[PDB]
Amino acid sequence: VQALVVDNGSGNVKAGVAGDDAPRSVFPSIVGRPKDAFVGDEAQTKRGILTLKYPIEHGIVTNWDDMEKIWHHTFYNELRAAPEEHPVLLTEAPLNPKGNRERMTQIMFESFNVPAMYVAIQAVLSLYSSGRTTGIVLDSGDGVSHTVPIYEGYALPHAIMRLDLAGRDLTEYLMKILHERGYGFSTSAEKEIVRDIKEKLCYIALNFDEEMKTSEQSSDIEKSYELPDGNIITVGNERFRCPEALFQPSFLGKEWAGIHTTTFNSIKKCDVDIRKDLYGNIVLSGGTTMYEGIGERLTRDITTLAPSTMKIKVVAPPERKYSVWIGGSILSSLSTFQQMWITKEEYDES
Amino acid sequence: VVEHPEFLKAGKEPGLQIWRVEKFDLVPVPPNLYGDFFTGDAYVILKTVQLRNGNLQYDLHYWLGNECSQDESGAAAIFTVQLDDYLNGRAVQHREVQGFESSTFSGYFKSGLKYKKGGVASGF
Ligand SMILES: Nc1ncnc2c1ncn2[C@@H]1O[C@H](COP(=O)(O)OP(=O)(O)OP(=O)(O)O)[C@@H](O)[C@H]1O
Ligand SMILES: [Ca+2]
Ligand SMILES: [Ca+2]
Ligand SMILES: [Cl-]
Ligand SMILES: [K+]
Ligand SMILES: [Mg+2]
Ligand code: NA
Numbered sequence A: 001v002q003a004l005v006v007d008n009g010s011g012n013v014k015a016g017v018a019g020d021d022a023p024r025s026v027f028p029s030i031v032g033r034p035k036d037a038f039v040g041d042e043a044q045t046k047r048g049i050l051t052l053k054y055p056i057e058h059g060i061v062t063n064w065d066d067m068e069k070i071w072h073h074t075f076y077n078e079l080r081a082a083p084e085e086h087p088v089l090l091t092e093a094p095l096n097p098k099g100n101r102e103r104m105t106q107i108m109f110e111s112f113n114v115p116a117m118y119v120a121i122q123a124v125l126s127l128y129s130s131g132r133t134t135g136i137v138l139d140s141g142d143g144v145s146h147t148v149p150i151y152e153g154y155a156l157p158h159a160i161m162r163l164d165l166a167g168r169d170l171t172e173y174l175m176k177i178l179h180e181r182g183y184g185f186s187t188s189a190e191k192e193i194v195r196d197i198k199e200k201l202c203y204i205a206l207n208f209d210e211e212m213k214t215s216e217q218s219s220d221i222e223k224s225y226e227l228p229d230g231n232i233i234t235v236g237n238e239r240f241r242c243p244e245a246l247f248q249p250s251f252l253g254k255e256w257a258g259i260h261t262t263t264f265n266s267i268k269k270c271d272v273d274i275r276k277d278l279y280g281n282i283v284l285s286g287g288t289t290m291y292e293g294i295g296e297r298l299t300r301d302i303t304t305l306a307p308s309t310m311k312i313k314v315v316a317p318p319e320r321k322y323s324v325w326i327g328g329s330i331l332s333s334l335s336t337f338q339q340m341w342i343t344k345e346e347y348d349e350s
Numbered sequence B: 001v002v003e004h005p006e007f008l009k010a011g012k013e014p015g016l017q018i019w020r021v022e023k024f025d026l027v028p029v030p031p032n033l034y035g036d037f038f039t040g041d042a043y044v045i046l047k048t049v050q051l052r053n054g055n056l057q058y059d060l061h062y063w064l065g066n067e068c069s070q071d072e073s074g075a076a077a078i079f080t081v082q083l084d085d086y087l088n089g090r091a092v093q094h095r096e097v098q099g100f101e102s103s104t105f106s107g108y109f110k111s112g113l114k115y116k117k118g119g120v121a122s123g124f
Helices: A064-079 A098-110 A122-129 A167-181 A188-201 A208-216 A238-244 A259-268 A272-279 A294-305 A320-331 A344-348 B005-009 B070-086
Strands: A004-008 A012-017 A025-028 A031-034 A050-053 A088-092 A116-121 A135-140 A145-151 A161-163 A223-226 A232-235 A282-285 B015-022 B025-028 B036-038 B042-050 B056-064 B091-097 B114-116
Touching (some): A025 A064, A064 A098, A088 A320, A116 A122, A122 A145, A122 A282, A167 A188, A259 A294, A282 A294, B056 B070
Antiparallel strands (some): A012 A025, A135 A145, B042 B056
C-alpha cells in the first residue's frame, strides 16, 4: 500500500503519494466559513460570502477544527484517497510542542482512522532530499523561517532558531513600499496579486548599498508586470528592497536578527567540533529561499560573520521549494518505512 | 527498524560491504564490481574494523554519483542514518561525492576508485 505524504505548510498544503517527485496537490492553507466550510482555492473564490482564517499561521497548528477541515479537504477533494486505507506521513515544524504532535496524532487515528502514521520534522526531510545527513537547513516558508542544525541524521534541538519573518511578511512589505509610487494594494485579493509580483520580479542584492546606488543611476532596474485588469505596473528598487528585509528586519520595524545572523547564531549553539560540517552544508529550503541572488548574498554575509578558518558553502537545490515534501516522498517509499510508523492498533491500546 | 535483511547482515565481521540504492531499497553490490561505481547511482558503504580490544569499529560512507537521481541520493542518506541507528549510533558517517572522495574511502579499494557510465533507473 502506498503512503500519502502531507506537508502542513503555514501558507500552502503540499500533498501527494509516496514515490512521486513532486506534490500533486498544492493549495492554500485557508478555511472559509459563512459570514459550512470551504478550503483552499474554493475559499478564495468565495471570499465575499466567507470569513477566511489561517489555521497554521506560523507553522504551528492553532485552530484544530479548521485544521481538520484542511485535512479532510486534502484526503477527499484533492487526493480522493481513503485516509483509513493508507499510511500517512505528516510533517511538523521544528520545535513543534509534543502536545501539538499528540493532538494531530489523535485526530489522524480517531477522526480519520488512519491505519499507520509517521510524523517527520520538515527541515530533516529537506536535508535528506539534498543527499545529506549533516548540515544546517534554512527553511523559509510563508509564515515562518527556521534554522535547523542536523548531525548524522538528527536535529539538534538546543540550536534550532525560529524567525517569524518569512514570505507573507515580504508580500506585506512590498504592499507597503509600493505606496511610494502611488499603489494602494490592501485587500486580500490584492495581496495575492502582490505576492505574484514579488515572486516574479524581486531579487536579492549581492550588496544592498551598492545596488541602491546603481539602481538610482538609470531606469534599467524597472520591470513591468501585467495586472489582472490589464493595467501595467512598473517596479524599480522595490524589486530588491522587499527581500532585503530577510537580512534587515529593521525594514519592518523589528529588532530581529536577519537570516544570515540567525544561521550563524544557530551554528554557534553547536559544539565547536561539528561546526565545520554545518558551515560546509548550509541547505536552503522553502519558497522564500527562491529569490535570485540568495545563495551568493548569504555566502558573503555568513562568511563575514563566521571565523575565517571555516569553509562556507550555501546549497540552493533547484527544487528546494518542495524539498520537505520530496524528502517525505523518499522516506515513505523506502523498504524500511513500515518499521518506522505507529499503527492505529498500537495507538488505540497505548 | 531492524527487520531489513541487509541490516541483519551489516557489520557482523571485519570487512567491506557495499550496497547500491535501487528503487528505494538497499541491494548488495556483486563483489566482483567493488571499486567500480556507476556515475548514475548512489551507494552505501560500511567498513568494519576489528579493534585491539575485540570490539568492532564502523565507518559508513554514502557515495553520490554525479548523475544519480534525487531519490537515490536521498535514500542513500536516509539508509545511512538507519544503518547507524541499527549499529547503536556507533558508526561515523561520511558523505562522498564522485571525484572528491576522502582518502580513507579511496583507500578501501586496492585498485582505486573508478567510475562507469549509466546506472539503475530512478525510482521517481
Ligand atoms: N519564486 C519565489 N520567490 C519568492 N518567494 C516565493 C517564490 N515562490 C514562492 N514564494 C513564496 O514562498 C511562500 C510559500 O512557500 P512554502 O509554501 O514553502 O511556505 P509554507 O511552507 O507554505 O509556510 P511554512 O513553511 O512557513 O509554514 C509564499 O509566501 C510564496 O510567495
Ligand atoms: Ca540511477
Ligand atoms: Ca553515529
Ligand atoms: Cl570572517
Ligand atoms: K518554514
Ligand atoms: Mg514549509
Ligand atoms: Na566548513
